[PDB]
Design an enzyme around this catalytic site. Structure first.
Site, mmCIF file in Angstrom:
data_model
loop_
_atom_site.group_PDB
_atom_site.id
_atom_site.type_symbol
_atom_site.label_atom_id
_atom_site.label_comp_id
_atom_site.label_asym_id
_atom_site.label_seq_id
_atom_site.Cartn_x
_atom_site.Cartn_y
_atom_site.Cartn_z
ATOM 1 N N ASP B 8 3.922 -6.384 -3.162
ATOM 2 C CA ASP B 8 1.645 -5.618 -3.532
ATOM 3 C C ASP B 8 1.522 -5.458 -4.738
ATOM 4 O O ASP B 8 2.020 -4.966 -5.871
ATOM 5 C CB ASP B 8 0.967 -5.795 -2.444
ATOM 6 C CG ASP B 8 -0.252 -5.488 -3.155
ATOM 7 O OD1 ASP B 8 -1.000 -5.953 -2.662
ATOM 8 O OD2 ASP B 8 -1.080 -4.637 -3.346
ATOM 9 N N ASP B 10 -2.415 -4.584 -6.442
ATOM 10 C CA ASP B 10 -3.445 -4.411 -6.988
ATOM 11 C C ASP B 10 -3.254 -2.999 -6.066
ATOM 12 O O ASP B 10 -2.553 -2.995 -4.965
ATOM 13 C CB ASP B 10 -4.957 -4.660 -6.022
ATOM 14 C CG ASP B 10 -5.528 -5.835 -7.475
ATOM 15 O OD1 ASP B 10 -4.926 -5.260 -8.224
ATOM 16 O OD2 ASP B 10 -5.894 -6.931 -7.325
HETATM 17 MG MG LIG Z 1 -3.046 -4.200 -2.503
#
Ligand SMILES: [Mg+2]
Ligand SMILES: [Cl-]
Ligand SMILES: [Mg+2]
Ligand SMILES: [Mg+2]
Ligand SMILES: [Mg+2]
Ligand code: NA
Lengths: 242, 242
Positions: B8, B10
């Site tokens: 992922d 962020d």
């Molecule tokens: Mg995230």
């Protein structure tokens, strides 16, 4: 300081959507000597800083972003107004709801998003959505010219909300502008009424009936002067104030 | 027998909405000596470039913007898909039309703008409008916790569109997400099917129900590890890949 030269932002003081040239920014501070200067545009205080500069409130004696609904005098904020405060939440919702339900019954080849853009001085209503591609924008415009969908929508709006203090107009290729009556550039003129200026010279490019300057250009309280480009704008001012 | 570490963005590789650090940028490339790496996020490719670098497709073995609906492999575009292509403009409009009529009937304290945001992988439907101020969001969320406006709407949608292969989840404080089934982060896994990776490690920071990583984390095709910040992401990889 008995006169005021009220300039429009785009097509007048800078290039459309561009930053003011350093030269023009020079001539405006040169003219400031003989008259008070000011800017007005349907652009928020930010776009006015992107184009004129973050120190916009200091480089002018009047800053009227959003057609004056947000206003400054002498670098100090004067007031702020919004369509919600003028029409009231209830009427705002009755307009939004009418437009949403209307756009839902329009048969298009494509629909996208942001059908109702809320701004403090106007609602921007689009049957396709302001997030459409450029190809999709054209598709709607061409079809609009033949089917006249936006025109029928404007007519129904004026009948639905008759005598509610609102103006409906076709704006651009895909949208429809909604704003209280007189909330065009002419709204900035109410912040100058009791200041008593011998002449308020307005300067703008869309003096065409149907443009965003026509109303202020034709308004009794201003001496309108049409400008083709910022170079033209500085020319006229050179003579008026030699 | 290769392996893959799917990250992922962020909160996992970068700070939220921020630019990656060079320590993390140099860690990931050092890590590429032991395993392939890839990145998946909801943001479009342009925001991935901004945060992870302009040479992102040359630095990650897989780049999966918009949850993989746009996919890149070894610096070459794999394929692209969008909601309008999977569902069709026919149904896209049937969905948008229902939501607009529905919203026009929800009596709220206030309505604003951007009631429907169109993205390549979903639609974000907000009764109040996703262009409202903080103090407006909160006013709605409070009322929503007491009258369950969004939940009534979600339940009505699921019935109206049952069988069309859609998913209606509640997001944020004011919106309702609408996306085809499977079009969460799990979508990228399809591009890794025939690769034969012995292990596909996944790392994310919102792995609990409601977070945008919960689906891919619990998917049996992945060995998931929950991280708190890019520093934790590093730590776990140092153990898994000594
Ligand atoms: Mg995230
Ligand atoms: Cl909208
Ligand atoms: Mg102009
Ligand atoms: Mg006049
Ligand atoms: Mg798993
Ligand atoms: Na679950």
């Amino acid at each position: 300081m008995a006169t005021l030269c009220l300039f429009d932002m785009d097509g007048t003081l800078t290039a459309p959507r561009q930053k003011i040239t350093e030269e023009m920014d020079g001539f405006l501070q040169k003219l400031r000597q003989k008259t008070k200067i000011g800017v007005v545009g349907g652009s928020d205080f930010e776009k006015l800083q992107e184009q004129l500069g973050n120190d916009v409130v200091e480089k002018y004696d009047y800053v009227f972003p959003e057609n004056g609904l947000v206003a400054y005098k002498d670098g100090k904020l004067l007031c702020k107004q919004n369509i919600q405060g003028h029409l009231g939440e209830d009427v705002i919702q009755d307009l939004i709801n009418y437009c949403l339900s209307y756009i839902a019954n329009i048969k298009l080849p494509k629909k996208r998003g942001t059908f109702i853009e809320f701004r403090n001085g106007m609602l921007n209503v689009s049957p396709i959505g302001r997030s459409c591609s450029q190809e999709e924008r054209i598709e709607f415009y061409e079809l609009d010219k033949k089917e006249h969908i936006r025109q029928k929508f404007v007519a129904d709006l004026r009948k639905e909300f008759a005598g509610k203090g609102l103006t409906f107009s076709i704006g651009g290729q895909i949208s429809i502008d909604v704003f209280p009556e007189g909330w065009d550039k002419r709204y900035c003129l109410r912040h100058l009424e009791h200041a008593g200026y011998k002449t308020i010279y307005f300067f703008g490019d869309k003096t065409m009936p149907g443009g965003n300057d026509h109303e202020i250009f034709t308004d009794p309280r201003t001496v309108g002067y049409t400008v083709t480009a910022p170079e033209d704008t500085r020319r006229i001012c050179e003579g008026l104030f030699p």
